[model samples]
Target: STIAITNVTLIDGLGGLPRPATTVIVEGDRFATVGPSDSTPVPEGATVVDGNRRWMVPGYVNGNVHLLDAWMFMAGPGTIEYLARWEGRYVEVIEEAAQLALRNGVTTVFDTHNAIEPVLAARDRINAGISQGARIFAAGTIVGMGGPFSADFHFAGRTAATRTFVDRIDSMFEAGVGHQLSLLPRKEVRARVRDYLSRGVDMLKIAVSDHIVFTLVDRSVGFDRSYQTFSRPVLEVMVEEARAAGVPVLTHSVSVEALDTSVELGADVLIHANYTLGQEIPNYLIDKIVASDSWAGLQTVHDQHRQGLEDVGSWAAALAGEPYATNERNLISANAKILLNTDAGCPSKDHLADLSPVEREDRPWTIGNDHFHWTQSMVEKGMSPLEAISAATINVARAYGKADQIGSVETGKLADFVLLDQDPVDDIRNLRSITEVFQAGAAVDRAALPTTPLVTAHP
Candidate 1:
């Protein structure tokens, strides 16, 4: 007997009917038994939690994010240098970022893009118990694109994306993230894939488009386009080689053309499918995505476009209102195996740890409280709460290949769970009613947690 949670409604995270008046026995780090309280016996000398019919659920998994949120865009000229500083204080800021995810009831976070050095070490520290936070999974560094206009080729000081950066790969691994990787020669594709796999990246990441921002001008908006990093052959070789080595490939794509390319090339995951930018998705696009059985990690620019569309009061209005608003709403409701993600656009309190004294005073350091708003908005969009929750749990777990160990609340799974004061099934918004969060069967000290202010969803 270790811990027994009785008299609770268990959502269980399988998108099934909610079980009422359930009791769960947890021993060590896995559930020992889970059933109706009336029948499941709680042993003597066990710690008992009287759930009082409140909700007990599996902790969530966020499939997409970048730990270095807002820094590159916000810092500009100084952004290239921030990776070193970000890693230099890995224990200080990155661990805080992971903890913030845990506090939000997320047990794991997958970084789609990161400097190989900074994020992986932070992941290792958390796994080694050197820090406290969500479990980390990384693709090491984002790979894709190679040309005069390509990002890896267009560093601020460098004349063009060149082998100079490639020459720095060994040094970058030595020095950490301040160094970068971009599109490499088609000849080196398999070798580079082998290098990252040798270093133990959980998966491979592909950058299909350079920078795609939605231009909004009274609703006649269109998506901005840039050169694609890899051609058909490059993606095919990368995907085939990575899969041959037993790793999955995730791509960050913008624009319909880029998405089509990624899907055709067999990328397993698409990072920002919210490419509508105020247009209807190809109508057939949804079918293709479903047919592919691939995952869509949607980051809908939640804070701004959502509230803006909400003020207008109709999807008809939003048709010409903001970028990707209706399409995001549509996709979540479309009922595919969507993976919950927030593009790491909001700045979390953790990112402020190394901020300059001048910058610190000027900023409030808010972020890491996003799943609540986004999940709530999905619910408002008429998605079933069960399905919405799955996107963050089982769906994402499967995407990261952790479903066997982490997704469901079963007798053999890790006991990472959250207790809510109210039922999130009533309104997924109630997920914010988090009273106690537990990871590996231990309660996180919420009261003792650092007071970190999260970024607001709106301007």
Candidate 2:
């Protein structure tokens, strides 16, 4: 079956100028042709979509996401019920998240952190056509961070949950390479990472910085002094195993030193690259990042959302302020490679109801609206709309070594793109005006997504 979208405005995701009146032909799962509409002939029997006056861009790709609702499950009060209700069926929860992401035109997502078995199972099911959702490429777990029950995020959960249940969930996420690895000798760390890599993770993410949020009394004093989670040698060992396994290495960093070390280690993607715990990223450090092959994954919060978080006294508000925003602006100005890294996931309905209306409105950490808020925020932080689109699309694919397959509107690539009723170039917010979405040359029934709404359901 052939599908032809004619007379469309194409933003090819290659940083090229948008081509007007273009005709894109998709045959089966790959793009067959893309040329000037007037010169291109649509097959007689092909299904035609009149894309006149529409804008077509590669489907949005998120570089950093936790498909199983990491942020809320780790730090919010809803962890117990959320996990208990969905424990055995974690794959379905991930599928619901992927579907929700797809409905919003996020055609591909690289899940930087998730439980090993379930996330990969969900990824395989989606790829095998047994499931319907955005394409998922999963990292399984962050190397040095523990599960939600650990000090890494919310240790209090252990007291609240049954011991057996807590341990079970933690082991699922750790996959034998948890905070315990931080205490192990370099040789032992190497062996553990080697064994972990054999599990077939799409990427390897190492927690370069410590995550001890539970110990902080005053949430405002942001991570007083950032500490490295693993020794330098252990970090190297993890990177070595990832390279040997032929997977990209991602760094979960929060402060300047951690970020600097990541660049020095040649990390493929630096998650939260602008987050230096409220300190401005020095100009020289910015230069080093730009000079390297690492793509900076920026987790940004838009102005309105930032203000809302502040009003609620949420610690995350600081992540959107002063030096952090400036770091992001500086990185963009320096022409450093960037990816739209929203640490977002599907939040339980109870969690959504817990937020103030303003905080919930277009929240940057919620999967469906996250990419939209991120692109708009990037435009506000010195990126052209076109540049923002690339950051949210091809830049992510390139960072994950997936550009040849799914990131652009080029011939021989997967037919994953979004047709918009409004031009995003005129206003990045227009990205939300999705007319339709195509993944692997097939139209998605947006209304039918989240086929089984578990986290998304309202009581």
Candidate 3:
């Protein structure tokens, strides 16, 4: 059905002024026009949606996520078994998530699915529901010899075992999956990465955090005794190989040292920036990233996890120190090419309570409830809201090679946008006040979607 939204505040996603009382016309899954109501004649039989002068912004684009492995971390080692228990409920949860995302003004999602079978099945279900929910881009998973966190999890045995894993991944790709890649470590996984890149993988994921060393083992275990640091040579080789193959490499790192190495190697996306490793990010590395014009996929939505600790004196001290230390680093790197992402699988306890946890969480001493504060953090460190919005929308679309289709609202662009009860540009916090959402010109009612399971476990 053709629809016209009139008397709205429009943020075109191009860093422009919010056009007031404008009329946006949508017809058959695409935007027909956007301008003064009287300027363009309304087509016959078009449904009229009165915006009530409310804020209308381009729908948010999520660049990084793991949607299929619901509560895998909670499942511990028996992740497959845990997933199996939710067999009949998988589609229900996905529908709930898509609706939740839409109501939160997130219309385009890049969901990384690690569990092969269910992940693919979930993707298909989400796609089938496009008429009812958000636009989903599923990234099929290919774990390196070992999984990203554990070395023992990599498929081990003869070359035949390796070939079987490769074959499985190849089949997923041949089926026309987008955003497909395998996770790898700098050392022991470079050869395999090169093979995958040669076989035409879209992107590569690397673990920079010595997870086993830092988290699994204690610091007193000693660096030499731990398998924490990834070999610089392996990282350098992988970076060079990816560059030659024209594929991007996303590294999971929170330390300045790892980020510096990633920059030197021309890595495309920096997964998380939680820890600075007790030092400021150097100017040289920032300059190098700017020169190379590489992108940083910052997961601002995950910062909500830090809100609970702000009251502790030691935690406050550490957090305060980071802004002073990393502000300059962010100012330089963020403007280059940053994409907004939420590590969505692990929903907070309050996630199901309200649609806008970020706004509701803000208290006198608290940093706020959800990851939306990450955008505020960026602004505090010297970025504009428009810049932040661009990272969350257009830049992500460009990263995934969908710039021509989604992202911005222009003639011929996808009719994806969100209606806000307030203007986020005036106060970024108002983003949480999303009232309605549209994907491909269809309005979505959040309450119509399935409710999240009440139990504190992965669906």
Candidate 4:
């Protein structure tokens, strides 16, 4: 359907003053015009959306996430026991999350890790409109060391072996999805990625230090140097293989050793700018990352928890936490292109299990308009609100090699945008003022979508 939104205020992902009296034309799935109000004539019979001088901006892109993981985080009876209710309906969970994300104003998402069948089917189903939800790009399985679900999240070693890269690490929570593991032996790294690509995975997600396949941590050693799963050559080979397949690589890193290994191997995207548990990530290391041109996927929620946890407790407490601090300042100062990621994993895991009673008790949640925390976290550092929005939108698209497509409000791009009742540029909290959501020339009517049991310990 062709649509035109006229007399509106526009804020492209680019950091510039919001332009007023702008017009945007969406013909079918792509933008036909994006300029001054009178620049381009509207198409005949297009659905007209009144700009009414309201604010419009590109929808968000979650640079790192596992949409199905958050549900487990919902405080409840035994996680698995609750999850058992959804037993054969994992795809339903994905659909719920995908729609929830879209209703919340996220148009595109990159599921960092998921099952080949359930989520891929869900991705295909949603993109084709068999299910109503956000557009999804994803990696089928993770490359790492421990359980398919990551060692820290394993449920008594029940995580699917084929989906994991298992070794040794205490459990933090359990994951029902992404548990189908694959041992990412250096010798088989390239082959495995090649296989997933053949099965139509959009990218590769690897872990360095601390889980199933690639950098499975040998926690027995603790603190100093856990075993690095893949050798340097293996890391290089996997990356080379991914590049040859025309996909990007995102890595989950913790220890300085793992972080350095990831950066050196050309990780196109790096998750959580955690201060390496083994050592500090000072300005020098920040410079190394910045100069390398890798995309930073910052997860501050996890970062803060990890840092505060470490300062106040034991190594196990540190290990038990999701994952650190100040480096965001260093990264922002370096002008490193960043993408906002909550680690917005699915809610099914009791990831809060390891937190202190007060810490666990003090948690909160957001259904879809979630990145506001990201906006606040970055602002709490030195970044401006616009910069935070850029990270949540364009920077993430660029990291996914999608700069030409969905990141900004531009001609020839998808008509994926959010309409907020208030201007966010003045104060990031205005992001909560969402009014409507349009995806590919259609109104999302978030008010019409069904609700879910997505409540947390508190909203």
**Who wins the lDDT comparison?**
2
Number of clashes in every candidate structure? 7, 0, 2, 40
Q: Rank the candidates by TM-score, best first.
A: 2, 4, 1, 3
Q: Write the per-residue lDDT of candidate 4 for residues 1-459, one digit (tens) a residue.
A: 678888878888688787887888887888778887473567678777787748887888777666656323222224444244464576767677777778778888888755556678878988887778888886665665332333434333344332232221111111221222334454554555566567677887775555421123344444544455556666677778778888888887866777877888889888765646654565577788888889887665434544555565633434434324455666777787788776554454345554566454322233364576677667766777776787788888988888898866887887789988887865776776778888877788698663344423222
Count residue pairs with overlapping backbones in model 3: 2
How well does each candidate superpose onto the true structure, as a TM-score?
Answer: 0.80, 0.97, 0.72, 0.81
Model 2, span 157-272: residue lDDT tens: 77988899999888998888878877779898888888988998899999999887644636446557568998887788888889999999999888888889999999998899
What value does the lDDT take at residue 72 in candidate 4?
36
lDDT of 3 by residue, 1-459 (tens): 788887877888777876886778887888888788563656767887888858887887776655543223221233333333444565554554555556567787765434444445555665576334456665444322233223322122213234554344334322322112233444435555566556433556555544332224233322222222456665566667767777566765556677777666666666554344445556556566666766766543224434443343322224334443254445334455666654555333433343234333442111112235555655654566766676677877876667888866877788888888876774777777767788788877665553454224533
For residue 306, give model 4's deviation from the true position in Å. 10
Model 4 clash count equals: 40
RMSD value for candidate 2: 1.3
Distance from true location, Cα of 438 in model 1, Å: 0.9
lDDT of 1 by residue, 302-327 (tens): 34444444464422224223556566
What candidate 4 gets wrong by more than 4 Å, as runs, is 38-40, 70-77, 145-150, 157-185, 212-227, 302-323, 346-369, 450-459
* Runs off by more than 4 Å, candidate 2: 37-39, 217-220
